[PDB]
Amino acid sequence: RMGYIPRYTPWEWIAIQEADQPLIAEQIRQDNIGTSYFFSLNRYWRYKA
Amino acid sequence: ERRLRILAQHRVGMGVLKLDADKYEDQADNVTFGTTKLSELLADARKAQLGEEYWPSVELKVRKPSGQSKAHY
Amino acid sequence: YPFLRRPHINPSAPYFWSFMTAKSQMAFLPEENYITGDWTGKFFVSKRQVYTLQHATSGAKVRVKIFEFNSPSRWNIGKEMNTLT
Amino acid sequence: NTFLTSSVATPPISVIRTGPKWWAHPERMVRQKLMYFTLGVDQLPLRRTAVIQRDLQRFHMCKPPPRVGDSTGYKRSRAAQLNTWYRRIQYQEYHMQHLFTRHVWGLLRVYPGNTTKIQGKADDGYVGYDSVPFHRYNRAPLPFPARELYERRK
Amino acid sequence: RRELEKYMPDITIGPKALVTPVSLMNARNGHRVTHDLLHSYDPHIG
Amino acid sequence: VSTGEFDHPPFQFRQRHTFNTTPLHDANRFGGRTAYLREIGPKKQGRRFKKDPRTVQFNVDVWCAQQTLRKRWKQRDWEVIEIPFRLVPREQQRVIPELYTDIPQMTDPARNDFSNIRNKVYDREELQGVLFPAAGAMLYPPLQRVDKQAMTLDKYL
Amino acid sequence: FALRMAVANALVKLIPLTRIPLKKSGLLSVDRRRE
Amino acid sequence: GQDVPKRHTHFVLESRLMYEKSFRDCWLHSVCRAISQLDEPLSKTVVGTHQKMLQRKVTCFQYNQYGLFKTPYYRLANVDRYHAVQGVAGTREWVPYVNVSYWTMNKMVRGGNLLVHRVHYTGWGTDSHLKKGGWEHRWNKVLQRNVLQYSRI
RNA sequence: AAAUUAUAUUAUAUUAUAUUUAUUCAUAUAAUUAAUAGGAUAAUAUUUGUAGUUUUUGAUACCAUGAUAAGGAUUAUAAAUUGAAAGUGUUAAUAUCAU
């Protein structure tokens, strides 16, 4: 071959690059209650809106 | 629908009410504020079901009196 | 060079209160016409301090960066130190 | 006329050298024809000027061929004979425009610019509200208000 | 200052007017003190 | 399409009143509105703004906007009266969107009326039962409309 | 000039033999002059 | 060497501290200026003597802040970080994206550090808005992308 | 004494003669130093004025650079195309501050 560079990254290399980095838990964005109309914008000052 | 179109002038466009919430730094507080504003706009627009005094007035471009009417002046 | 963006920044009778002065009379005097906090004394005052009645009334010391105002009068009252020099 | 400022005179060769820009501008040449057509006057030096410059603009982008050499100066002098012939017709329309416009402005009670002569009213150059307080070439002080060349009742 | 206070009146609230409350921290990019120098609230710099 | 002047002439050598050349500040330009921005002679805050290009371009944009506004308001032979939904005619009994919200709405494509509802102007004499119920004396006379089928001078009779 | 070139190209596209005089008059020809 | 003398590093760090003090003080100074310089009533609740007393009190609060950053941004927005040459914002002696002078931009072009594409020096590059209307039209297009495409809530 | 290389376009200028201002210049000045430090949803270290003191800002030279002007040759045997335009060589004077 002598100079072969792939134009598609192989499935093993994609799997290794996926298996090394964690997930963000807020990416799931699940919601079943509703919006807190009174409290969510008036929470504690360090974590406030 | 008429009261919702008048109360949300440029936020309604092509049959779709769109609200761009940019108030808070986080998107969760932004979607909370957007849900609150959508519910407030809906509750204000629902007043047309109470009576005809909440039906918004049609704005007619009524002409000036014509030359046939101005001839009697 | 852009318009009126130079970092290093005249008698007129009908434009006396409107030339190099504040636009409105409703606004208050600037920060140099008042004492901010605990001071040991300033060697000179800024050029944007408005000459008030108490400048010509008391007359302790007027040092502008120099400039010594030892001739008090009432024709200077209501005007900053720019056009007085 | 609303142009009452002091003006700068130009030689007539510099006017005609503008060509299609100002001298033979087609919008300007049309409204010169409406002045002559209103007075019952044939537009013959203006039609002579337009027919010349219509064909002059047609070949004005062509490059002249190199002349390899002539024994006598006859084809070069003929090309120069017609060239100075075209300037003299355009000199006549340059005078015909300035003649009739100053004559119409005396009829319509139109006050001209500074140092401009109207043959019926102001034999000298009429000056009104100049920056110089005196007459520039008559050396006379100007009165206040400006000189009235016509009567009052419109 | 004692001769400067005649023509120039004194408005001295004190150091309480230089320290904004904790509820105004995020409006002022995290700060509370309005000094000429910046003030970090960590002990390692402090 | 309009052929009036919009831009300001640029800054160059001081022009003279010659052929094809007007001075940079003349009373003929912009209705004489350059009289505010001119210097008659052939204080820095009152001299620098007369020579800035963005300032004079903003000023002539303001003046052209004033001209556009007065010509759009001189076109108006009408006025807007807030009429309730019940007494309005049949073409306005629909949901009319706001300006620049939807496609420009035709008046009635079913009744072969293809025209913008926002440009519709109704006569005052046809709405006297709506605008004036308290008078009861018919303050405006009825509009005489010509008989289109009558044999007149237009139809060679 | 641009309007003339557009109308001439439309006439060439509609009737093809119209290209025989219209190219000879130089109406289908583009000059490259900028400011 | 080595990178730049340390007095210039001190100068760039003082410019960064001035930017940080601007971020610290701008909201407070803007609220104080907008309360203290208003003649219309603030609310139905606060009118008359209460409004004038509140404006005098917020003016006393605004004047008592020693070190409040009221300096505009364009007065010291021409500081270069690699070299000590001072340019002018608005002229060709300054480039806005990489925020260096013309000399430093030429050295980083000739050094190969940046990835920049050369275009003809009398054209408008490649941007269709820039070829269309110039600097003001791309200015308005950046405004239209940043703000005016959002329906405010 | 021909071929045309030629740009060409229009405007301005001064102690008339004195006055204010943007920059320039005079003479008074303020500003000074050094280095890291992880904090909710984590199976257990309480912690940070602590480890730094005689901290770094200190080599503008006589190298053999490079710009200026000037002369050479090749291609059009087509009426088509939006568009018949592009590459290749020699001498004088000036000049050369990096162990």
mmCIF file of N, CA, C and O in Angstrom, chain D residues 94-152:
data_model
loop_
_atom_site.group_PDB
_atom_site.id
_atom_site.type_symbol
_atom_site.label_atom_id
_atom_site.label_comp_id
_atom_site.label_asym_id
_atom_site.label_seq_id
_atom_site.Cartn_x
_atom_site.Cartn_y
_atom_site.Cartn_z
ATOM 1 N N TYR D 94 -22.858 76.694 -28.676
ATOM 2 C CA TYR D 94 -22.442 77.201 -27.374
ATOM 3 C C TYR D 94 -22.770 78.678 -27.222
ATOM 4 O O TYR D 94 -23.035 79.141 -26.109
ATOM 5 N N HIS D 95 -22.755 79.429 -28.320
ATOM 6 C CA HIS D 95 -23.193 80.814 -28.259
ATOM 7 C C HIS D 95 -24.704 80.933 -28.382
ATOM 8 O O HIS D 95 -25.295 81.842 -27.794
ATOM 9 N N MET D 96 -25.344 80.027 -29.130
ATOM 10 C CA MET D 96 -26.793 80.087 -29.298
ATOM 11 C C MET D 96 -27.530 79.727 -28.016
ATOM 12 O O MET D 96 -28.637 80.226 -27.781
ATOM 13 N N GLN D 97 -26.945 78.860 -27.187
ATOM 14 C CA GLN D 97 -27.551 78.550 -25.898
ATOM 15 C C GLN D 97 -27.467 79.736 -24.952
ATOM 16 O O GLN D 97 -28.458 80.095 -24.311
ATOM 17 N N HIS D 98 -26.296 80.365 -24.863
ATOM 18 C CA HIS D 98 -26.117 81.505 -23.977
ATOM 19 C C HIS D 98 -26.809 82.762 -24.487
ATOM 20 O O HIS D 98 -27.072 83.671 -23.694
ATOM 21 N N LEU D 99 -27.110 82.835 -25.785
ATOM 22 C CA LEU D 99 -27.835 83.984 -26.315
ATOM 23 C C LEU D 99 -29.311 83.926 -25.950
ATOM 24 O O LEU D 99 -29.867 84.896 -25.425
ATOM 25 N N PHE D 100 -29.958 82.795 -26.228
ATOM 26 C CA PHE D 100 -31.399 82.697 -26.044
ATOM 27 C C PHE D 100 -31.791 82.589 -24.580
ATOM 28 O O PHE D 100 -32.863 83.074 -24.203
ATOM 29 N N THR D 101 -30.944 81.980 -23.747
ATOM 30 C CA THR D 101 -31.280 81.804 -22.337
ATOM 31 C C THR D 101 -31.268 83.138 -21.601
ATOM 32 O O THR D 101 -32.149 83.407 -20.775
ATOM 33 N N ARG D 102 -30.297 83.998 -21.911
ATOM 34 C CA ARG D 102 -30.293 85.343 -21.348
ATOM 35 C C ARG D 102 -31.409 86.200 -21.930
ATOM 36 O O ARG D 102 -31.832 87.175 -21.300
ATOM 37 N N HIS D 103 -31.899 85.860 -23.123
ATOM 38 C CA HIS D 103 -33.018 86.601 -23.689
ATOM 39 C C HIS D 103 -34.343 86.147 -23.095
ATOM 40 O O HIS D 103 -35.246 86.966 -22.895
ATOM 41 N N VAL D 104 -34.477 84.850 -22.812
ATOM 42 C CA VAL D 104 -35.685 84.338 -22.170
ATOM 43 C C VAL D 104 -35.748 84.786 -20.713
ATOM 44 O O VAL D 104 -36.819 85.141 -20.204
ATOM 45 N N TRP D 105 -34.592 84.840 -20.037
ATOM 46 C CA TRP D 105 -34.552 85.257 -18.636
ATOM 47 C C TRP D 105 -34.915 86.725 -18.459
ATOM 48 O O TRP D 105 -35.360 87.123 -17.378
ATOM 49 N N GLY D 106 -34.727 87.545 -19.492
ATOM 50 C CA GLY D 106 -35.239 88.901 -19.448
ATOM 51 C C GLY D 106 -36.738 88.986 -19.630
ATOM 52 O O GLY D 106 -37.351 89.964 -19.190
ATOM 53 N N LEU D 107 -37.342 87.982 -20.265
ATOM 54 C CA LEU D 107 -38.782 87.956 -20.488
ATOM 55 C C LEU D 107 -39.541 87.395 -19.295
ATOM 56 O O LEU D 107 -40.633 87.873 -18.974
ATOM 57 N N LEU D 108 -38.982 86.389 -18.629
ATOM 58 C CA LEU D 108 -39.635 85.727 -17.512
ATOM 59 C C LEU D 108 -39.336 86.384 -16.174
ATOM 60 O O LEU D 108 -39.685 85.810 -15.135
ATOM 61 N N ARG D 109 -38.705 87.564 -16.189
ATOM 62 C CA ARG D 109 -38.314 88.330 -14.999
ATOM 63 C C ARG D 109 -37.432 87.502 -14.066
ATOM 64 O O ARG D 109 -37.622 87.467 -12.849
ATOM 65 N N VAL D 110 -36.452 86.827 -14.656
ATOM 66 C CA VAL D 110 -35.576 85.910 -13.939
ATOM 67 C C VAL D 110 -34.267 86.628 -13.645
ATOM 68 O O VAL D 110 -33.601 87.127 -14.560
ATOM 69 N N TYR D 111 -33.902 86.687 -12.372
ATOM 70 C CA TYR D 111 -32.660 87.336 -11.970
ATOM 71 C C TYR D 111 -31.496 86.366 -12.132
ATOM 72 O O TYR D 111 -31.538 85.260 -11.582
ATOM 73 N N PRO D 112 -30.451 86.737 -12.868
ATOM 74 C CA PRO D 112 -29.352 85.797 -13.117
ATOM 75 C C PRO D 112 -28.366 85.725 -11.965
ATOM 76 O O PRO D 112 -28.583 86.327 -10.909
ATOM 77 N N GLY D 113 -27.275 84.995 -12.163
ATOM 78 C CA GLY D 113 -26.220 84.923 -11.176
ATOM 79 C C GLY D 113 -25.386 86.192 -11.129
ATOM 80 O O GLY D 113 -25.668 87.201 -11.777
ATOM 81 N N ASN D 114 -24.325 86.130 -10.332
ATOM 82 C CA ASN D 114 -23.446 87.280 -10.177
ATOM 83 C C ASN D 114 -22.584 87.470 -11.418
ATOM 84 O O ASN D 114 -22.161 86.499 -12.053
ATOM 85 N N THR D 115 -22.330 88.743 -11.753
ATOM 86 C CA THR D 115 -21.546 89.198 -12.916
ATOM 87 C C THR D 115 -22.084 88.657 -14.241
ATOM 88 O O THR D 115 -21.326 88.467 -15.194
ATOM 89 N N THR D 116 -23.391 88.432 -14.331
ATOM 90 C CA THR D 116 -24.018 87.902 -15.534
ATOM 91 C C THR D 116 -24.813 89.014 -16.206
ATOM 92 O O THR D 116 -25.583 89.719 -15.546
ATOM 93 N N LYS D 117 -24.617 89.173 -17.512
ATOM 94 C CA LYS D 117 -25.200 90.268 -18.274
ATOM 95 C C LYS D 117 -26.462 89.808 -18.992
ATOM 96 O O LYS D 117 -26.454 88.779 -19.674
ATOM 97 N N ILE D 118 -27.541 90.571 -18.832
ATOM 98 C CA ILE D 118 -28.756 90.420 -19.627
ATOM 99 C C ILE D 118 -28.906 91.686 -20.459
ATOM 100 O O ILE D 118 -28.938 92.791 -19.904
ATOM 101 N N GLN D 119 -29.017 91.517 -21.784
ATOM 102 C CA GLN D 119 -28.833 92.619 -22.731
ATOM 103 C C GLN D 119 -29.903 93.696 -22.583
ATOM 104 O O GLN D 119 -29.609 94.892 -22.685
ATOM 105 N N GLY D 120 -31.140 93.298 -22.313
ATOM 106 C CA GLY D 120 -32.203 94.270 -22.159
ATOM 107 C C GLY D 120 -32.176 95.023 -20.845
ATOM 108 O O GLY D 120 -32.468 96.222 -20.807
ATOM 109 N N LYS D 121 -31.824 94.336 -19.757
ATOM 110 C CA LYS D 121 -31.948 94.895 -18.414
ATOM 111 C C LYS D 121 -30.619 95.390 -17.849
ATOM 112 O O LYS D 121 -30.493 96.568 -17.500
ATOM 113 N N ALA D 122 -29.623 94.514 -17.752
ATOM 114 C CA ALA D 122 -28.361 94.825 -17.079
ATOM 115 C C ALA D 122 -27.215 94.674 -18.074
ATOM 116 O O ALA D 122 -26.728 93.562 -18.300
ATOM 117 N N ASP D 123 -26.789 95.799 -18.657
ATOM 118 C CA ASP D 123 -25.676 95.776 -19.603
ATOM 119 C C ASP D 123 -24.375 95.396 -18.911
ATOM 120 O O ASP D 123 -23.561 94.651 -19.469
ATOM 121 N N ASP D 124 -24.162 95.893 -17.698
ATOM 122 C CA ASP D 124 -23.064 95.411 -16.881
ATOM 123 C C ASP D 124 -23.428 94.060 -16.268
ATOM 124 O O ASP D 124 -24.564 93.586 -16.364
ATOM 125 N N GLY D 125 -22.443 93.431 -15.634
ATOM 126 C CA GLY D 125 -22.682 92.174 -14.950
ATOM 127 C C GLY D 125 -23.520 92.391 -13.705
ATOM 128 O O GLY D 125 -23.090 93.098 -12.777
ATOM 129 N N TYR D 126 -24.718 91.810 -13.671
ATOM 130 C CA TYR D 126 -25.608 91.987 -12.528
ATOM 131 C C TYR D 126 -25.076 91.212 -11.332
ATOM 132 O O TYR D 126 -24.818 90.009 -11.429
ATOM 133 N N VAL D 127 -24.913 91.900 -10.207
ATOM 134 C CA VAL D 127 -24.431 91.301 -8.970
ATOM 135 C C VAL D 127 -25.463 91.528 -7.874
ATOM 136 O O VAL D 127 -25.924 92.657 -7.668
ATOM 137 N N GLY D 128 -25.835 90.451 -7.191
ATOM 138 C CA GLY D 128 -26.742 90.542 -6.066
ATOM 139 C C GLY D 128 -26.356 89.603 -4.943
ATOM 140 O O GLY D 128 -26.283 88.386 -5.151
ATOM 141 N N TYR D 129 -26.113 90.176 -3.758
ATOM 142 C CA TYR D 129 -25.747 89.463 -2.528
ATOM 143 C C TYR D 129 -24.488 88.616 -2.719
ATOM 144 O O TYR D 129 -24.501 87.389 -2.607
ATOM 145 N N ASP D 130 -23.394 89.301 -3.023
ATOM 146 C CA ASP D 130 -22.092 88.667 -3.137
ATOM 147 C C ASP D 130 -21.404 88.651 -1.775
ATOM 148 O O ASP D 130 -21.734 89.433 -0.879
ATOM 149 N N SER D 131 -20.450 87.728 -1.621
ATOM 150 C CA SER D 131 -19.620 87.716 -0.419
ATOM 151 C C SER D 131 -18.732 88.953 -0.361
ATOM 152 O O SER D 131 -18.542 89.539 0.710
ATOM 153 N N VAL D 132 -18.183 89.355 -1.499
ATOM 154 C CA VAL D 132 -17.490 90.643 -1.602
ATOM 155 C C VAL D 132 -18.523 91.763 -1.534
ATOM 156 O O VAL D 132 -19.520 91.724 -2.279
ATOM 157 N N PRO D 133 -18.351 92.764 -0.661
ATOM 158 C CA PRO D 133 -19.396 93.789 -0.502
ATOM 159 C C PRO D 133 -19.504 94.756 -1.668
ATOM 160 O O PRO D 133 -20.511 95.468 -1.760
ATOM 161 N N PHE D 134 -18.513 94.816 -2.549
ATOM 162 C CA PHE D 134 -18.529 95.727 -3.683
ATOM 163 C C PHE D 134 -18.617 94.946 -4.989
ATOM 164 O O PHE D 134 -18.528 93.717 -5.017
ATOM 165 N N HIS D 135 -18.812 95.688 -6.078
ATOM 166 C CA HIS D 135 -18.781 95.094 -7.407
ATOM 167 C C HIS D 135 -17.351 94.695 -7.749
ATOM 168 O O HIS D 135 -16.422 95.495 -7.595
ATOM 169 N N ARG D 136 -17.182 93.456 -8.221
ATOM 170 C CA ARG D 136 -15.849 92.869 -8.330
ATOM 171 C C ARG D 136 -15.039 93.498 -9.457
ATOM 172 O O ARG D 136 -13.814 93.626 -9.347
ATOM 173 N N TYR D 137 -15.693 93.895 -10.549
ATOM 174 C CA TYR D 137 -14.969 94.444 -11.686
ATOM 175 C C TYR D 137 -15.450 95.817 -12.128
ATOM 176 O O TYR D 137 -14.791 96.434 -12.971
ATOM 177 N N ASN D 138 -16.563 96.316 -11.591
ATOM 178 C CA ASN D 138 -16.934 97.712 -11.786
ATOM 179 C C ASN D 138 -16.390 98.620 -10.694
ATOM 180 O O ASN D 138 -16.431 99.846 -10.863
ATOM 181 N N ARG D 139 -15.896 98.034 -9.592
ATOM 182 C CA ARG D 139 -15.315 98.744 -8.444
ATOM 183 C C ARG D 139 -16.308 99.732 -7.828
ATOM 184 O O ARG D 139 -15.985 100.891 -7.561
ATOM 185 N N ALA D 140 -17.528 99.258 -7.602
ATOM 186 C CA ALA D 140 -18.598 100.075 -7.058
ATOM 187 C C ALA D 140 -19.224 99.390 -5.854
ATOM 188 O O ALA D 140 -19.367 98.163 -5.840
ATOM 189 N N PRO D 141 -19.604 100.154 -4.828
ATOM 190 C CA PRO D 141 -20.236 99.542 -3.651
ATOM 191 C C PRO D 141 -21.661 99.098 -3.943
ATOM 192 O O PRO D 141 -22.411 99.771 -4.655
ATOM 193 N N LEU D 142 -22.032 97.948 -3.381
ATOM 194 C CA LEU D 142 -23.352 97.381 -3.627
ATOM 195 C C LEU D 142 -24.369 97.924 -2.627
ATOM 196 O O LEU D 142 -24.079 98.006 -1.430
ATOM 197 N N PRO D 143 -25.555 98.297 -3.093
ATOM 198 C CA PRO D 143 -26.591 98.784 -2.182
ATOM 199 C C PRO D 143 -27.334 97.625 -1.529
ATOM 200 O O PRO D 143 -27.252 96.473 -1.956
ATOM 201 N N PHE D 144 -28.065 97.956 -0.468
ATOM 202 C CA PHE D 144 -28.942 97.009 0.188
ATOM 203 C C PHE D 144 -30.377 97.514 0.104
ATOM 204 O O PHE D 144 -30.645 98.657 0.498
ATOM 205 N N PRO D 145 -31.327 96.713 -0.407
ATOM 206 C CA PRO D 145 -31.180 95.349 -0.928
ATOM 207 C C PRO D 145 -30.621 95.292 -2.349
ATOM 208 O O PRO D 145 -30.092 96.289 -2.842
ATOM 209 N N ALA D 146 -30.742 94.131 -2.989
ATOM 210 C CA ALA D 146 -30.167 93.922 -4.309
ATOM 211 C C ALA D 146 -30.907 94.735 -5.368
ATOM 212 O O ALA D 146 -32.030 95.205 -5.166
ATOM 213 N N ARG D 147 -30.245 94.906 -6.509
ATOM 214 C CA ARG D 147 -30.797 95.700 -7.598
ATOM 215 C C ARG D 147 -31.950 94.960 -8.262
ATOM 216 O O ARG D 147 -31.846 93.769 -8.567
ATOM 217 N N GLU D 148 -33.059 95.665 -8.472
ATOM 218 C CA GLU D 148 -34.222 95.103 -9.144
ATOM 219 C C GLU D 148 -34.156 95.444 -10.627
ATOM 220 O O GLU D 148 -34.162 96.622 -11.001
ATOM 221 N N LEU D 149 -34.092 94.415 -11.468
ATOM 222 C CA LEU D 149 -34.006 94.597 -12.909
ATOM 223 C C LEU D 149 -35.364 94.769 -13.571
ATOM 224 O O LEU D 149 -35.419 95.175 -14.736
ATOM 225 N N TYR D 150 -36.452 94.477 -12.865
ATOM 226 C CA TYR D 150 -37.783 94.446 -13.451
ATOM 227 C C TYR D 150 -38.741 95.239 -12.572
ATOM 228 O O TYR D 150 -38.375 95.736 -11.502
ATOM 229 N N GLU D 151 -39.983 95.353 -13.032
ATOM 230 C CA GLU D 151 -41.032 95.988 -12.254
ATOM 231 C C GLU D 151 -41.577 95.022 -11.203
ATOM 232 O O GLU D 151 -41.124 93.884 -11.065
ATOM 233 N N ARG D 152 -42.567 95.494 -10.445
ATOM 234 C CA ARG D 152 -42.993 94.781 -9.247
ATOM 235 C C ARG D 152 -44.163 93.831 -9.493
ATOM 236 O O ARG D 152 -44.085 92.653 -9.129
#
